[PDB]
Amino acid sequence: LHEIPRERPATPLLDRASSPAELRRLGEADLETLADELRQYLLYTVGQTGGHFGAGLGVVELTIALHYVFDTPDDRLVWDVGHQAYPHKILTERRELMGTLRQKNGLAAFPRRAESEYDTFGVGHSSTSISAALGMAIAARLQGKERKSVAVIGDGALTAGMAFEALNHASEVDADMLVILNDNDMSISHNVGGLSNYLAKIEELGWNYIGPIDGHDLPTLVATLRNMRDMKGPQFLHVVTKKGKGFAPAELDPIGYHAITKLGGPKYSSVFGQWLCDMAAQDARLLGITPAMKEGSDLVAFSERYPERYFDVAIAEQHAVTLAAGMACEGMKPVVAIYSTFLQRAYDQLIHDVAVQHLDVLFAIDRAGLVGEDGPTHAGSFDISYLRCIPGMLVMTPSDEDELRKLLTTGYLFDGPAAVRYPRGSGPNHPIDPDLQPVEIGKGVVRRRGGRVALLVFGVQLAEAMKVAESLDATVVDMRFVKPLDEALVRELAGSHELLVTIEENAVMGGAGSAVGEFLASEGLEVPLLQLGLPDYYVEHAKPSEMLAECGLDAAGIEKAVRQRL
Amino acid sequence: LHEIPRERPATPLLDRASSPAELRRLGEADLETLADELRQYLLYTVGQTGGHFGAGLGVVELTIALHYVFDTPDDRLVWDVGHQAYPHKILTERRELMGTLRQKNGLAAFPRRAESEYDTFGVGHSSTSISAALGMAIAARLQGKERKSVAVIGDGALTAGMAFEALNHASEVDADMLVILNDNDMSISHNVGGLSNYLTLFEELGWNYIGPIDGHDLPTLVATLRNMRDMKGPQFLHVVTKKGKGFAPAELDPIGYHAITKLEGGPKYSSVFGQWLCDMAAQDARLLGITPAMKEGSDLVAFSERYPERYFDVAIAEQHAVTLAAGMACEGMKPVVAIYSTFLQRAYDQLIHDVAVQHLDVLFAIDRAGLVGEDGPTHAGSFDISYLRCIPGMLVMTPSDEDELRKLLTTGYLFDGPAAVRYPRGSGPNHPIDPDLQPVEIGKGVVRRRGGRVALLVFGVQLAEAMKVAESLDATVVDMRFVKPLDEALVRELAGSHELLVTIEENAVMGGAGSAVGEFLASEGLEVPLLQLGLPDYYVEHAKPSEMLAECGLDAAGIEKAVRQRL
Amino acid sequence: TLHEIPRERPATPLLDRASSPAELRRLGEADLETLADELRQYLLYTVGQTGGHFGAGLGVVELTIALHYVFDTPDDRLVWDVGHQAYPHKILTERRELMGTLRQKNGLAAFPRRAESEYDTFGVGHSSTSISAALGMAIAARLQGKERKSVAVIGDGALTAGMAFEALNHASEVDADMLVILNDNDMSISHNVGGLSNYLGTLFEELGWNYIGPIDGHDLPTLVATLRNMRDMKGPQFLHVVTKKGKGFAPAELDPIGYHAITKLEA
Ligand SMILES: CC(=O)c1sc(CCOP(=O)(O)OP(=O)(O)O)c(C)[n+]1Cc1cnc(C)nc1N
Ligand SMILES: CC(=O)c1sc(CCOP(=O)(O)OP(=O)(O)O)c(C)[n+]1Cc1cnc(C)nc1N
Ligand SMILES: CC(=O)c1sc(CCOP(=O)(O)OP(=O)(O)O)c(C)[n+]1Cc1cnc(C)nc1N
Ligand SMILES: [Ca+2]
Ligand SMILES: [Ca+2]
Ligand SMILES: [Ca+2]
Ligand SMILES: [Ca+2]
Ligand SMILES: [Ca+2]
Ligand SMILES: [Ca+2]
Ligand SMILES: [Ca+2]
Ligand SMILES: [Mg+2]
Ligand SMILES: [Mg+2]
Ligand SMILES: [Mg+2]
Ligand code: NA
Ligand code: NA
């Protein structure tokens, strides 16, 4: 196909395969026709709602063959990451709900146990499928159940150390389970690493290896899976698919068609990428590291201009950070670009390898806060809380594009570990100073001098706080730093106002507001304190504006909370 | 050798090899005599100070060969974990300082950059060597330097996922570095895993594989290392050693001689956990026990022997341990993940994303919570209250003694969802232990003393010290039991009836349990003075556990001074 | 503990020469734990072949060995209540190699049966008859001057029946020399629901019995030593033993209701 259908296509066979049991009533001869119907229904629905695209097209045939051969849901199927599971959802009683995908109160971006009995494991982060399938298999064997356990993992997800740990342990316990490698020679960008090179060529770690087989040959898939369903012990099936199969533009541009949109101001990631290039042009020591997120974190231009100083480590957050630590030992200046939600997988390397040694590493933490449709598996809700308790960390929260550039510079030049957090999307579109100069560490900026109540803002809610301050005539501080905190300013405001209000796009528990509270307590300052931030639950996916409103982090919610406290 | 020398042995050659430069002036025919003298000194000094034992004996020859062939410190040598690096320190200008090993203001337990230019990377946690060495190699090439990069990694450390990530990336960048696999077929316990069975995969990943060679044949070591030193690209040398080599008692008992105490109470909290795990497993066939290669430390020994079909050592793979538990819980089994606070840092994402987000029924038994003593800051359990209590769904508990640990383990286990119970290394006040297996009410503290003006809210094992302070001051003391959910009702009552609330925890004050109390007081508009006592915002230098606690003010003397200074 | 039912005869060198109690009693005590393992293996295999009751027999593997080891069967009278847990008993009383005929036409019966073996003292099936039966044998033996022991093994479920209460009270009255062993696993077929289960030894002593226990029913050293002591004691004796239904087969330990009985395995 060359165009996405704008009208609900005619899919008669698909309508008779609304569940795996119904699918298993059809004949093998019908399956090739079912793959075409599903493929064009998939194209139609993702065009109506936007979402992940190319990966799911590559597993249309594998998904049909899997539910046709295995006794789902009793047999356990685990999809790694889950961004390729739209065909799965379509064949597990959610076809007619795909119109709600990634919308408020609609289907989630990824498989979710609470969403369907056909989803064995909630995924989003990568490389968890083998571990989860192994735990299921170990349980089923002790329980005496005959159910099968199958994990479908892509070549990109297989680059994570946690997959290596699972493969080794599964061999050790002689688990009866099937690992299906979905090898399309791609991640989001092209795959990197020695593992990818080996996979282009052609298992000794205790796995019975079968393949490679054509992942779009349904007759072959069905026959191979049938043979391996009943084989005992760790089984490894190597399948080859083409990302975007069946849609020519995606087959040609698999990076651009990894995800699509349905039917001003630079993105913060783009402000970072420009700062990265500008600083690299002035300082040969700068090295840029990403764990397989060149496009999202936006190291595109940097990777092209400075290929010798750009490092894609695959989906290996752990190694990215310890690698940077080693680079810093030689006097180089590494910058680790990493989403807040993925940095929690490198927490030990940040603490033990960087912070304990006070090494000069800059962490550019994108997707800080609520990320919208991708939902809670990807929310950057905790990085202020889990970083600010670590000795040696300089923790910064820019409030707009200009502040991001300046605080990146400040943390980069700081001789020690530094973190700069910023959200998905674009900002208030304020002018950006082209110079590359730092700001004083541990000093906030008073954006508005008023009275009675003072709003201490850590990050991008500053614009909303300024609106609230218009009606209440409040003081507004752009705090800039969580750690070290501008204690002198906090002390002054605590003595001159009747209420301090902290605002952050991070869990209230342990967050920036609590750093202010810790300081007030240590000095015996008794001013009332209202802490605004993310609540202690997982916010259901929706538009970012809807999630912020639910959490009370828009002007309306902030004003309501302040007035009620007053 | 058969006995540890009690008097300093005569080592005329070792005395002439106080640094690598001096060592390299010696002749090859001298190195095997030096190896003998080093082994004797090592036995002597570790006998004097206590410390890690068997692993270092295994690398005596490897260490000599490495510093003899490579141009250290210009060439970069990275030891994985570093518990096997005493010979390294003996040969790098620290032999006569080994008498201070693991003592306050003395040499650290592991290599440490601030301690010596010969220590390229501070280690303690495992499996970081390849990543660090690759970063130095990359930097050196970009800088136009011609230095070598070497990483020595044991077969146990190689089971971690981050070592796999590093091997994969090094091939991609075609870095000039040497990885030496120190294979003795052991971890702390026996190395169990699919990789130990295998021990080519290294060849297929882009590495030039040489070996296996005799890690105790100095002539072969020097010749082989010399050959690969100037080879280009990723090089991988497979070496075979014996843990405890040259000391028969250690060769015969490698577990017990992994570490020794210097030559010449109640149960350890780990032992209380081990007994609880066996007792609960006897009553519930669904319980499964998981450890990442720490059967001895967390004390799953009896459990592993009695319930071998429900015990799982995943090797040094903290990440897999947690997600594996998540999968088990999906099928209705009841996994208990035994993990040190410092090592749970490496599985944070799996706890959040695979367990907490799904509210799966997994119990985390968090040992070595707080200051751990001589192992120093790399192993401190300083942060688990802070990094867990911010996670929605987590039940976070802090027992104050042995009976409380048993009760809260039962409480966390019976709770249907993610639960964490944290406790320190060592033993406790030795209070009576109720043999029953009964939970306590969730989110409720216990008032242990009723006093007047100060209320001490204790989260964990400082309770006994706080009781001493409260008897001196006639103060109120609360055994909080739970960080999350907090006993808000009790905190509210004490905030109205006392002039000062004092929170005490063996965790970072920043983000800690005291800050949970602060968050509550602020949200309710309660403005009672609050004094937060806990671990400071720096890395506490190694010493005896009591000396480190005294430094942090978490003994009775420090607590009382802090309280009275506030008042 | 196993996870799979053996599909082929396991090697059981010790069991094979413990074909009868007299032969079992010639083995040393240090070999009984290994025999327990082999018996359990064979039980899993043969019941996988024929069908049959399952979990209850797994729970009394060790009890059965100790009973035939300490008591002089078949001269000493052993009575199994219900009898669905008596496959180990049959395996040790000259019927191991006949278990392949279990519950088939012209093969071994589902329960102990006097006509089937001199080692079966009482045909059972309905529950709670063992105390009554053993007491009748004890009274008769005393009257005919024959010094023999009388033992009833009854489960906690079977003990809820009124007739077990009648028998306990009469035995105390006549001061009979007999041993009642309560096989307590907190199960009937379903979970054991009732007042007696909640109580589970004051009740038994008030009724006139010498109560001992609770002891671990899978600790052979303890079982043998305890049974030897009570064998040398007279009058109404009551031993409280605690077992795990399905012991040694993890699927059964996890689903005791569903593994009360199984159907023949199919390939
Ligand atoms: C959207 C998202 O979260 C994806 S999808 C994807 C590529 C995985 O490639 P794979 O070969 O496994 O699948 P394929 O698309 O079929 O080729 C990445 C890196 N990510 C981001 C990411 C980064 N890091 C981690 C630990 N997890 C995730 N999910
Ligand atoms: C004491 C400590 O920190 C050691 S030493 C060791 C195994 C050493 O095995 P290896 O084969 O690498 O070396 P060997 O002793 O010479 O055989 C472990 C698991 N630990 C604890 C541990 C647990 N988990 C992690 C991530 N790091 C460490 N250091
Ligand atoms: C299958 C059959 O006939 C069994 S087994 C059993 C309970 C077994 O519990 P017990 O504690 O005595 O032994 P255990 O299995 O070892 O726990 C019952 C009620 N039944 C049915 C039944 C019902 N009612 C009567 C009078 N007799 C019998 N046998
Ligand atoms: Ca796109
Ligand atoms: Ca600005
Ligand atoms: Ca300027
Ligand atoms: Ca905004
Ligand atoms: Ca539980
Ligand atoms: Ca302590
Ligand atoms: Ca008093
Ligand atoms: Mg791929
Ligand atoms: Mg080893
Ligand atoms: Mg019963
Ligand atoms: Na020892
Ligand atoms: Na059944």
What is the residue-wise DSSP string for B295-322?
A: HHHHT-HHHHHH-GGGEEE--S-HHHHH
Collect all residues of chain C within an 8 Å Cβ-Cβ radius of residue A141. Answer: 3
- Measured CA to CA, the distance from residue C132 to residue C161 in angstroms comes to 12
The shares of helix, strand and coil residues in chain A, as percent rounded to the nearest 5, are 45, 20, 40
Distance from CA of A67 to the nearest CA of B (A): 20
> Which atom of ligand 1 lies at the shortest distance from residue A58's CA?
16
Which residue reads 């950070």 in tokens?
A321
DSSP-assigned beta bridge partners for residue B486: none
**C39: Cβ–Cβ under 8 A, 6 or more apart, which residues?**
C12, C15, C61, C64, C65, C88, C91, C92
CB atoms within 10 A of CB B104: 13
* Short-list B154, B72, B82, CA closest to B118: B72
Angle at A292 between CA B204 and CA A288, to 5 degrees: 105
Report chain A residues touching chain C, CB-CB < 8 A. Answer: 141-145
For ligand 2, say whether the CB of B154 is within 6 Å of any of its atoms.
yes
**A452: Cβ–Cβ under 8 A, 6 or more apart, which residues?**
A472, A473, A474, A497, A498, A499, A566
* Short-list A294, A314, A55, A288, CA closest to A161: A314
CB atoms within 10 A of CB A115: 16
Specify the 3-state DSSP secondary structure of B498.
Answer: coil
For ligand 1, say whether the CB of A181 is within 6 Å of any of its atoms.
no
How far apart are the CA of B481 and the centre of ligand 10, in A? 24
DSSP secondary structure code for residue C249 in this structure: B
C109 φ/ψ sector (left φ>0, alpha ψ -120 to 50, else beta): beta
DSSP-assigned beta bridge partners for residue A259: A52
- Measured CA to CA, the distance from residue B562 to residue B556 in angstroms comes to 10
Question: What is the crossing angle of helices A512-522 and A487-496, to 10°?
Answer: 70
- Whether B285 sits inside 8 A of C3 (CB atoms) is no
Which residue reads 């690096």 in tokens?
B85
What residue of B is the nearest CA neighbor of A137? B328
B395 to B215, B356, B401: CA distances (angstroms):
48, 10, 19
CB atoms within 10 A of CB A425: 15
**C91: Cβ–Cβ under 8 A, 6 or more apart, which residues?**
C15, C39, C42, C43, C46, C99
Specify the 3-state DSSP secondary structure of B350.
Answer: helix
- Contact in structure between B324 and B345 (CB atoms under 8 Å): no
- Whether A171 sits inside 8 A of B197 (CB atoms) is yes
| B140 has a chain A CB within 8 A of its CB | yes
How far apart are the CA of A141 and the centre of ligand 15, in A? 17
Could you tell me how many helices (H) and strands (E) chain A has, helices first?
Answer: 24, 19
Q: CA A55, A61, A62, A66 torsion: positive or negative?
A: positive
- Measured CA to CA, the distance from residue B223 to residue B344 in angstroms comes to 41
CB atoms within 10 A of CB B239: 27
* Short-list A333, A161, A290, A350, CA closest to B125: A350
- Contact in structure between B70 and B43 (CB atoms under 8 Å): no
Interface test with C, best of B279, B283, B309 (most C CBs within 10 A): B309
A483 φ/ψ sector (left φ>0, alpha ψ -120 to 50, else beta): beta
Token digits for A295?
A: 């496009």
Instruction: State the SS3 of B35-88.
Output: HHHHHHHHHHHHHHHCEECHHHHHCHHHHHHHHHHCCCCCCEEEECCCCCCHHH
| B343 has a chain A CB within 8 A of its CB | yes
- Whether B285 sits inside 8 A of C254 (CB atoms) is yes
Q: What letter represents residue A177's amino acid? A: M
DSSP-assigned beta bridge partners for residue B501: B455, B530
* Short-list C127, C135, C197, CA closest to C162: C127
| A131 has a chain B CB within 8 A of its CB | yes
- Measured CA to CA, the distance from residue B2 to residue B170 in angstroms comes to 43
- Contact in structure between B366 and B412 (CB atoms under 8 Å): no
Token digits for A531?
A: 């802490």
B123 to A279, B315, B424: CA distances (angstroms):
31, 19, 22
Number of A/C CB contacts below 8 angstroms equals 16
- Contact in structure between A107 and A89 (CB atoms under 8 Å): yes
- Measured CA to CA, the distance from residue A547 to residue C109 in angstroms comes to 69
DSSP E strands, B161-216: 177-183, 208-214
**C69: Cβ–Cβ under 8 A, 6 or more apart, which residues?**
C21, C24, C25, C32, C224
Report chain B residues touching chain C, CB-CB < 8 A. Answer: 285-286, 307-309
For ligand 1, say whether the CB of A110 is within 6 Å of any of its atoms.
no
Which residue reads 């002891």 in tokens?
C215
Specify the 3-state DSSP secondary structure of A405.
Answer: helix
What residue of C is the nearest CA neighbor of B305? C1
The shares of helix, strand and coil residues in chain C, as percent rounded to the nearest 5, are 45, 15, 40
Distance from CA of C185 to the nearest CA of B (A): 11
- Measured CA to CA, the distance from residue A216 to residue A65 in angstroms comes to 10
Q: Which helix (H) or strand (E) holds B259?
A: strand B259-260
* Short-list A206, A213, A234, A236, CA closest to B201: A206
How far apart are the CA of B321 and the centre of ligand 11, in A? 25
- Chain B, residues 531-550, CB within 8 A of chain A, namely 531-532, 537-539
- Measured CA to CA, the distance from residue B323 to residue B348 in angstroms comes to 11
What residue of C is the nearest CA neighbor of A145? C251
- Of the residues B39, B243, B310, B407, which is catalytic? B243
Q: For chain B, state the CA radius of gyration.
A: 25
Distance from CA of C77 to the nearest CA of A (A): 38
Specify the 3-state DSSP secondary structure of C191.
Answer: strand
Collect all residues of chain B within an 8 Å Cβ-Cβ radius of residue A159. Answer: 165, 168
* Short-list B235, B185, B214, B259, CA closest to B32: B214
For ligand 2, say whether the CB of B186 is within 6 Å of any of its atoms.
yes
Query: Which string of DSSP letters, residue by residue, matches B354-400?
Result: IIITTT---EEEEES-B--STT-GGG-B-SHHHHHHTSTT-EEE---
- Contact in structure between B56 and B86 (CB atoms under 8 Å): yes
Token digits for B280?
A: 């609960």
How far apart are the CA of A437 and the centre of ligand 6, in A? 8
Long-range contacts of B34-39, Cβ-Cβ distance < 8 Å, separation of 24 or more:
B34/B64, B35/B60, B35/B61, B35/B64, B35/B218, B37/B9, B37/B11, B37/B12, B37/B13, B38/B11, B38/B14, B38/B63, B38/B64, B38/B87, B38/B90, B38/B91, B39/B1, B39/B246, B39/B247
Could you tell me how many helices (H) and strands (E) chain C has, helices first?
Answer: 12, 5
Q: What are phi and psi of B262, to 5 degrees?
A: -55, 145
Residues around ion ligand 10, judged by CB within 5 A, are: B 474
In chain B, after which residues does the backbone break, taking C–N over 2.5 angstroms as a break? 199, 264
* Short-list C211, C195, C217, C17, CA closest to C97: C17
Q: Beta strands B446-449 and B476-479: pairing type?
A: antiparallel
For ligand 3, say whether the CB of C245 is within 6 Å of any of its atoms.
yes
Collect all residues of chain B within an 8 Å Cβ-Cβ radius of residue A117. Answer: none
- Measured CA to CA, the distance from residue A487 to residue C156 in angstroms comes to 70
* Short-list B469, B376, B294, CA closest to B51: B376
Q: What's the reported resolution, in angstroms, to a tenth?
A: 2.0
- Measured CA to CA, the distance from residue A181 to residue A239 in angstroms comes to 6
For ligand 1, say whether the CB of A11 is within 6 Å of any of its atoms.
no
Among C189, C240, C245, C247, name the best residue to mutate to test ligand 3's pocket (greatest count of ligand atoms within 8 A of Cβ).
C189
- Contact in structure between B470 and B563 (CB atoms under 8 Å): no
Collect all residues of chain A within an 8 Å Cβ-Cβ radius of residue C250. Answer: 142-144
Collect all residues of chain B within an 8 Å Cβ-Cβ radius of residue A120. Answer: 330
Token digits for A512?
A: 């920036």
**Cis bond upstream, residue C74 (ω within 30):** yes
Long-range contacts of A22-26, Cβ-Cβ distance < 8 Å, separation of 24 or more:
A23/A64, A23/A67, A23/A68, A23/A91, A24/A67, A24/A68, A26/A68
| B157 has a chain A CB within 8 A of its CB | no
Token digits for A177?
A: 């389970």
Write out the catalytic residue numbers of A: 243, 317, 345
DSSP secondary structure code for residue A380 in this structure: B
DSSP secondary structure code for residue C92 in this structure: I
HSE, side-chain direction, 13 A CA sphere, residue A428: 18
Token digits for A47?
A: 């065009």
Write out the binding residues of C: 249
Query: Which string of DSSP letters, residue by residue, matches A304-355?
Result: HH-GGGEEE--S-HHHHHHHHHHHHHTT-EEEEEEEHHHHGGGHHIIIIIII
Q: Beta strands B149-154 and B76-79: pairing type?
A: parallel
Specify the 3-state DSSP secondary structure of C46.
Answer: helix
A219 to A478, B153, C131: CA distances (angstroms):
63, 46, 66
What residue of A is the nearest CA neighbor of C3? A142
Torsion on CA atoms A32, A37, A40, A45, rounded to nearest 10: -130
- Measured CA to CA, the distance from residue A415 to residue A413 in angstroms comes to 6
- Contact in structure between A447 and A463 (CB atoms under 8 Å): no
- Contact in structure between B145 and B115 (CB atoms under 8 Å): no
- Measured CA to CA, the distance from residue A157 to residue B239 in angstroms comes to 31
| B195 has a chain A CB within 8 A of its CB | yes
How far apart are the CA of A402 and the centre of ligand 5, in A? 5
- Whether B309 sits inside 8 A of C3 (CB atoms) is yes
Write out the binding residues of C for thiamine diphosphate: 249
B409 to A36, B280, B324, B336: CA distances (angstroms):
54, 10, 20, 10
- Whether A141 sits inside 8 A of C255 (CB atoms) is no
How far apart are the CA of A85 and the centre of ligand 1, in A? 13
HSE, side-chain direction, 13 A CA sphere, residue A296: 25
> How many residues does this entry show for chain A?
566
- Whether B172 sits inside 8 A of A192 (CB atoms) is yes
| B95 has a chain A CB within 8 A of its CB | no
B181 to A474, B62, B215, C261: CA distances (angstroms):
63, 11, 10, 53
What residue of A is the nearest CA neighbor of B192? A172
Q: Which helix (H) or strand (E) holds C41?
A: helix C32-50
| A206 has a chain B CB within 8 A of its CB | yes
Query: Which string of DSSP letters, residue by residue, matches A432-446?
Result: ---S-----TT--EE
Token digits for C79?
A: 């009575």
H-state helical runs in A70-160: 86-89, 129-143
Q: Which helix (H) or strand (E) holds C90?
A: helix C87-90
- Measured CA to CA, the distance from residue C44 to residue C36 in angstroms comes to 12
* Residue of B132, B192, B326 lying closest to A326 (CB–CB): B132
What residue of B is the nearest CA neighbor of A167? B194
Q: Determine whether B544 is an active site residue.
A: no
Torsion on CA atoms B110, B111, B112, B117, rounded to nearest 10: 160
